[PDB]
Amino acid sequence: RPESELIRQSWRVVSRSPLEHGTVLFARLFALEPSLLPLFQYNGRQFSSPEDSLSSPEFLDHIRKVMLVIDAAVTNVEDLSSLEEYLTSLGRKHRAVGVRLSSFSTVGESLLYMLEKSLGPDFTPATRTAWSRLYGAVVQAMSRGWDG
Numbered sequence: 001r002p003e004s005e006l007i008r009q010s011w012r013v014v015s016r017s018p019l020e021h022g023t024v025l026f027a028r029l030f031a032l033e034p035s036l037l038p039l040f041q042y043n044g045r046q047f048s049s050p051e052d053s054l055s056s057p058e059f060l061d062h063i064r065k066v067m068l069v070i071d072a073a074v075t076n077v078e079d080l081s082s083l084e085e086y087l088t089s090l091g092r093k094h095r096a097v098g099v100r101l102s103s104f105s106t107v108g109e110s111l112l113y114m115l116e117k118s119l120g121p122d123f124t125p126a127t128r129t130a131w132s133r134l135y136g137a138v139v140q141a142m143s144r145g146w147d148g
């Protein structure tokens with residue numbers, strides 16, 4: 001697929017520095033939707049502000065987790081059923097911690113935001129469409145996790 005190659009190529013530089021990039025993605029996410037901030041709780045405490053999340057080892061480690069799973073999706077772009085069971089299991093864990101399917105779109109926009117800002121003129125229309133379809137396939141796999 002030419003499309004799988006657009007994804008792989010655009011992901012290369014991001015994957016070289018996954019935390020700095022996931023940091024953009026989550027900074028965006030909490031700028032768009034600060035009501036997601038209390039979902040991330042460690043030691044029991046609640047992050048008061050988005051910048052508080054960026055000081056938390058548990059939260060930074062969470063970011064690297066997320067970026068590893070997107071990397072996995074990229075690795076498997078050509079099939080992506082090879083990941084479906086993992087992703088459905090990921091979906092279940094989300095439903096169990098109280099996330100709602102409606103939040104998926106804001107995360108997708110945060111991802112696409114981070115990619116546009118990283119790539120600039122290399123984030124071609126074709127690249128964006130490819131990413132939107134990949135993210136949508138990942139979401140559709142995870143959504144199963146809300147099946148029961």
Ligand code: HEM
Nearest residue numbers: 036039040062065066069070093097099100103104107138
């Ligand atoms: C619907 C929008 C989403 C919200 C609101 C959300 C929120 C969360 C929260 C609150 C946690 C648990 C945090 C913790 O206790 O440390 C989590 C875990 C995680 N998220 Fe998301 N998430 C969303 C979508 C996604 C997407 C699209 C992916 C990537 C495919 C993803 C990847 C992960 C991973 C890998 C974990 C760790 C799961 C584990 O520990 O087993 N999430 N997410």
